Design a protein around this ligand. Structure first.
Ligand SMILES: N[C@H](C(=O)O)[C@@H]1CC=NO1
Lengths: 348, 188
């Protein structure tokens, strides 16, 4: 048995992985904001209360359905910096340099989040950035109590943080002591940055003093992001990838995500079976799904990348005839081992 | 990564997945600015056939080039019924995102689970390499495991997958009803 769903019959729902951020989004709806207004408030709130994942130093995607029936996808994914190169993470022998793509300043793409938040607010929002970012600023300035789970994830990242003088300032208490469950976590410099954004918009992140701090710290610590990278960061409004499953329309993220394409591909394969007949958790149903997944991930490894740079056969991958061909290879009693799988089934 | 979902009274819906990649990103902050940098460069193929943090591989299509955006698995999704919002769904989990989101959607459409049931339901995963059927603890009983093993799956129990925040919207006489679910896996 499962707990009952959350229910609203008035203004809708705004749901995130942190109750403080969800509450902020929900209050925006209660105060007459639309789904975009709430989404923007949440994006900034999570940057403060969920720093493991929520951010202004990263990027992402927003898939949006508008009241007028339009469906759009916002790409605020990070970009490789201007000085990036194909083999930048390899040594002279052509071998991967341990941790270079994972820990530190060279591992970073040009952040898109702040640009993404502003882009959706400007095009589709109704409230002012100041109203929507103030709750995040309040939490950065005044702090919030570290949860049990946050104490745990902080501990798991501890040795990584200790590699960087910057992170030693922000993720440890006085005397470089570990933050513990129930400690007040205050983020004064983050509040300064958020205030620049409040006052100047996205230019408060991508230009001026904050852009100067980014370039400076990059130069100091072996990174390559510059003021030129930041001033040239662009969101892209893209067409979503669209499919159908049993009379429902699926709207999901297009390149530079692979997610929407393979989601629709796998559903397409599954659509050839009456899954409802045997129900949740039936081995026959799991088998059909798993074999579709197997092919999809093989296809991912060859065909998928940023379509602004490479040719991505999205239309072929989401074609129901291709899915039918995949389905017809699925045997009732056996799998196709991954060693035998060919991307596109060798016929794309 | 983290996913959030919003639906308003007018029929707008916004599904946002965003991230600094790993937990705490690159672990390096911008001194003076108070934020962590992403390690999103690891979502490129940094060498042909080299597995990344999620065991994903690539070649030319996802190679690094200046200004290029690294390939993602993020799947923020909206499902429509008669061009009206029915589901708003997404999840973190790197390579596991695609399969997590698929399962939630199928659980509603195929099996008529409510959105809480659809989210809490145990999840499986196949990503071709490694060639394994990944499951969650208590998620698959002996009879099902045995039948799938007999087919040739190598079944492995691993930590819980995903953190779905999802909304289902249904019509009523006056306006709509909104049903939501967070994911019990959030704190694991
Ligand atoms: N970096 C990954 C991707 O973009 O596919 C994120 C991290 C959390 N979910 O997926």
């Amino acid at each position: 048995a499962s707990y009952p769903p959350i229910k609203n019959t008035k203004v809708g729902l705004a749901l995130s992985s942190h109750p403080l951020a969800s509450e902020i989004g929900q209050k925006v709806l209660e105060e007459g904001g639309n789904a975009i207004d709430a989404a923007v408030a949440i994006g900034f709130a999570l940057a403060v209360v969920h720093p493991a994942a929520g951010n202004i130093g990263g990027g992402g995607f927003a898939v949006i359905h508008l009241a007028n029936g339009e469906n759009v996808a916002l790409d605020f994914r990070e970009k490789a910096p201007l000085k990036a190169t194909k083999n930048m993470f390899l040594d002279k022998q052509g071998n991967v340099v341990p941790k270079l793509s994972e820990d530190g300043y060279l591992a970073a793409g040009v952040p898109g989040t702040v640009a993404g938040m502003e882009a959706m607010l400007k095009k589709y929002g109704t409230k002012k950035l100041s109203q929507l970012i103030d709750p995040a600023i309040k939490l950065a300035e005044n702090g919030y109590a570290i949860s049990q789970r946050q104490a745990e994830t902080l501990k798991e990242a501890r040795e990584r943080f200790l590699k960087y003088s910057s992170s030693k300032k922000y993720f440890f208490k006085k005397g470089h002591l570990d933050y513990q469950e129930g400690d007040l976590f205050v983020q004064k410099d983050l509040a300064k940055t958020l205030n620049q954004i409040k006052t100047l918009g996205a230019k408060g992140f991508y230009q001026g003093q904050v852009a100067e701090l980014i370039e400076k710290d990059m130069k100091k610590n072996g990174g390559i992001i510059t003021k030129e990278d930041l001033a040239s960061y662009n969101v892209k409004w893209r067409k979503p990838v669209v499919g159908s499953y049993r009379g429902y329309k699926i709207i999901s993220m297009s390149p530079p995500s692979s997610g929407g394409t393979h989601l629709i591909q796998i559903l397409n394969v599954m659509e050839n079976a009456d899954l409802s007949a045997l129900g949740y958790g039936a081995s026959k149903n799991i088998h059909i799904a798993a074999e579709a997944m197997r092919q999809a991930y093989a296809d991912r490894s060859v065909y998928m990348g940023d379509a602004d740079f490479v040719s991505v056969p999205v239309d072929k991958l989401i074609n129901k005839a291709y899915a039918k061909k995949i389905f017809d290879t699925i045997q009732p009693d056996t799998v196709t081992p991954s060693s035998q799988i060919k991307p596109g089934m060798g016929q794309l | 990564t983290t996913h959030y979902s919003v639906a308003d009274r007018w029929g707008n819906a916004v599904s946002v997945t965003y991230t600094i990649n790993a937990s705490y990103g690159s672990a390096a902050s911008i001194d003076g600015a108070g934020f962590l940098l992403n390690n999103e460069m690891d979502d490129f193929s940094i060498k042909p056939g080299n597995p990344n943090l999620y065991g994903l591989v690539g070649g030319d299509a996802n190679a690094i080039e200046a200004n290029k955006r690294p390939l993602s698995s993020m799947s923020p999704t909206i499902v429509l019924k008669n061009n009206k919002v029915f589901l708003v769904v997404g999840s973190p989990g790197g390579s596991r995102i695609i399969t997590t989101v698929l399962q939630v959607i199928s659980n509603v459409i195929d099996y008529n689970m409510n959105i809480s049931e659809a989210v809490s339901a145990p999840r499986f995963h196949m990503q071709w390499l490694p060639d394994e059927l990944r499951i969650e603890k208590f998620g698959m009983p002996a009879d099902v495991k045995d039948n799938l093993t007999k087919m040739g799956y190598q079944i492995v129990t691993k930590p819980v997958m995903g953190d779905v925040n999802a909304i289902q919207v249904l019509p009523k006489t006056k306006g709509s009803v909104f049903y939501g679910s967070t994911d019990p896996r959030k704190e694991f």
